[PDB]
Amino acid sequence: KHKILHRLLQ
Amino acid sequence: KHKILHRLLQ
Amino acid sequence: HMLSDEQMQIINSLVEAHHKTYDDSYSDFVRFRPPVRRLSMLPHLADLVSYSIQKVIGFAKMIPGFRDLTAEDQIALLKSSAIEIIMLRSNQSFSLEDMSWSCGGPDFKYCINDVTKAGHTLELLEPLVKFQVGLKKLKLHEEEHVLLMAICLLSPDRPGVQDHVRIEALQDRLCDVLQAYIRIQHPGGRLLYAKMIQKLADLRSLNEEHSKQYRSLSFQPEHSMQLTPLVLEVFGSEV
Amino acid sequence: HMLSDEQMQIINSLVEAHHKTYDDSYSDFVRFRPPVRRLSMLPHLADLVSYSIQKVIGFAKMIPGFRDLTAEDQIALLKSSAIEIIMLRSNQSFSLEDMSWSCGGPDFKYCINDVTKAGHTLELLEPLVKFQVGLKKLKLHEEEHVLLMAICLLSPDRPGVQDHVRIEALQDRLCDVLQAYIRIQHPGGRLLYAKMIQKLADLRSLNEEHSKQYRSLSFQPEHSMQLTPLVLEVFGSEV
Numbered sequence: 001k002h003k004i005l006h007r008l009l010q
Numbered sequence: 011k012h013k014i015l016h017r018l019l020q
Numbered sequence: 021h022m023l024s025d026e027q028m029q030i031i032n033s034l035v036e037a038h039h040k041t042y043d044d045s046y047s048d049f050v051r052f053r054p055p056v057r058r059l060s061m062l063p064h065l066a067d068l069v070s071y072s073i074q075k076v077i078g079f080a081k082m083i084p085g086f087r088d089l090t091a092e093d094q095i096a097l098l099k100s101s102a103i104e105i106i107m108l109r110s111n112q113s114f115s116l117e118d119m120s121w122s123c124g125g126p127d128f129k130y131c132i133n134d135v136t137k138a139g140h141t142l143e144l145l146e147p148l149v150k151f152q153v154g155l156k157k158l159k160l161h162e163e164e165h166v167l168l169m170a171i172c173l174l175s176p177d178r179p180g181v182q183d184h185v186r187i188e189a190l191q192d193r194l195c196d197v198l199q200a201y202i203r204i205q206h207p208g209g210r211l212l213y214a215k216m217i218q219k220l221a222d223l224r225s226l227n228e229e230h231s232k233q234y235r236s237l238s239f240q241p242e243h244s245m246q247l248t249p250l251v252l253e254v255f256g257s258e259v
Numbered sequence: 260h261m262l263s264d265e266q267m268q269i270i271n272s273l274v275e276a277h278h279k280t281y282d283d284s285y286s287d288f289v290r291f292r293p294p295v296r297r298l299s300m301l302p303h304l305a306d307l308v309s310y311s312i313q314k315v316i317g318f319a320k321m322i323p324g325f326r327d328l329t330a331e332d333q334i335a336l337l338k339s340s341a342i343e344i345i346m347l348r349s350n351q352s353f354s355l356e357d358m359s360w361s362c363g364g365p366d367f368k369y370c371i372n373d374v375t376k377a378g379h380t381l382e383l384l385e386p387l388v389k390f391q392v393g394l395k396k397l398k399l400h401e402e403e404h405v406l407l408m409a410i411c412l413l414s415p416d417r418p419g420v421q422d423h424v425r426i427e428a429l430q431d432r433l434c435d436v437l438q439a440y441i442r443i444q445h446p447g448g449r450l451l452y453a454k455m456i457q458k459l460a461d462l463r464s465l466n467e468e469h470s471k472q473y474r475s476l477s478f479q480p481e482h483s484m485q486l487t488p489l490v491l492e493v494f495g496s497e498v
């Protein structure tokens with residue numbers, strides 16, 4: 001769930 | 011499930 | 021009659037964060053899928069938005085207090101405010117001379133007609149352009165533009181926010197900064213704060229029309245396959 | 260000692276389908292995200308592959324008998340054969356003079372080192388290049404190249420195929436065409452059919468190494484976000 005955003009949010 | 015491929019496969 | 025030391029540090033770190041995440045040269049636009057002028061503009065503008073979301077995330081992570089929110093509330097806030105912040109930050113490239121967004125030569129100059137060729141209709145682009153010229157005529161300071169984006173982003177009245185009080189207090193601390201800033205540092209701006217809060221209400225109504233017109237895109241796989249994975253993730257419905 | 264009327268119609272519609280879905284000018288490559296030479300090549304090659312999958316789907320839909328399969332088996336066959344067909348069709352641009360794929364000027368000429376800058380290692384690119392020069396030295400007719408791709412695509416020994424007998428019979432009908440073609444129409448080719456069937460076994464082992472190296476990409480969101488929605492859908496695990 002929200003793979004990319006979690007990564008982008010450090 | 012495979013949204014794009016189903017569309018591409020007409 | 022003088023800004024607090026806390027209030028200027030807030031202004032400082034918000035202005036520095038905007039400079040780290042906004043390139044006035046737009047030189048990175050050569051890395052997007054080129055524009056074509058069927059939805060010919062959709063690959064280039066989908067790349068443009070996708071890049072912009074990455075910049076908004078970089079800005080948000082430096083708004084004081086945003087990092088201490090749960091990751092859930094951070095995602096909730098970014099998912100529903102992203103197109104408003106893009107519309108807000110895009111004013112730096114808007115121009116009244118052409119009524120377009122001028123980010124380069126003729127290539128990265130985005131007419132109203134180009135954006136229609138990306139799957140959006142006048143009923144969004146008409147209020148959007150009008151919004152941009154009104155916003156442009158406010159002739160905002162850098163400190164105000166930057167504060168307005170962070171106030172927009174920290175709206176507690178957004179689907180899925182859990183900690184309503186924590187972000188409401190954050191948004192309040194930022195509005196106090198903006199109200200004080202305008203009053204101390206902006207001559208002739210005694211009516212300005214009300215006009216910026218009005219612009220937030222304009223953003224909600226533009227956000228609503230975009231997300232509706234985006235649903236119509238994302239349901240056609242031939243068009244949604246032209247998007248990027250970040251776009252799809254940010255503008256879709258999940259937890 | 261002479262091809263059946265049925266066998267030449269099969270050859271005809273397979274050769275026409277390859278011409279509709281393979282552009283020798285590579286002019287569409289200007290529409291991809293430009294190459295850069297961190298994984299600098301991944302956006303351009305991810306676009307290149309994504310485009311190629313769309314072409315392979317167009318080719319497959321014109322292989323006699325492929326349309327009558329269930330949509331499930333069609334998807335099963337395309338999901339696990341796609342990188343092999345791309346590796347196969349890519350031989351039309353490969354060149355022994357440079358050991359690269361030459362699709363344009365210096366921009367769309369793809370060295371071994373460019374593909375490493377897309378997140379793949381020598382243990383794939385070393386057997387892949389070797390595969391290409393062996394394939395190139397077979398000096399295949401257009402009719403054989405085209406038949407080999409369809410035989411590759413119609414492999415019943417692939418995860419998730421339901422109708423094992425229906426596709427096995429289709430692949431058999433195509434292998435008979437290729438065996439007869441080589442024997443009637445290809446002087447000095449009496450050892451060729453065995454060498455092409457060998458190339459299929461090479462493809463499985465390259466497919467296996469790619470999908471393993473792709474899993475390592477798709478688990479890093481910073482890289483997977485550089486892919487396209489079609490790529491992600493075709494190379495991921497679903498029903």
Ligand SMILES: C=C(CCC(C)(C)O)C[C@H](C)[C@H]1CC[C@H]2/C(=C/C=C3/C[C@@H](O)C[C@H](O)C3=C)CCC[C@]12C
Pocket residue numbers: 065066068069072103106107109110111112113114121123130135138140230234237247251
């Ligand atoms: C195609 C569109 C979206 C398609 C999808 C697929 C997302 O629906 C329409 C959007 C609604 C509008 C809003 C802002 C609009 C623009 C901004 C210009 C800039 C340049 C620079 O100033 C950086 C800045 O960040 C920025 C984004 C001009 C193009 C249309 C844009 C994205």
Ligand SMILES: C=C(CCC(C)(C)O)C[C@H](C)[C@H]1CC[C@H]2/C(=C/C=C3/C[C@@H](O)C[C@H](O)C3=C)CCC[C@]12C
Pocket residue numbers: 304305307308311342345346348349350351352353360362369374377379469473476486490
């Ligand atoms: C980056 C790669 C894949 C990344 C992902 C993200 C998918 O893992 C590596 C692949 C394994 C290999 C195989 C073929 C390889 C090539 C083909 C060239 C062409 C040009 C033309 O002849 C049309 C033809 O269709 C075609 C595809 C050269 C680049 C590397 C290519 C894709």
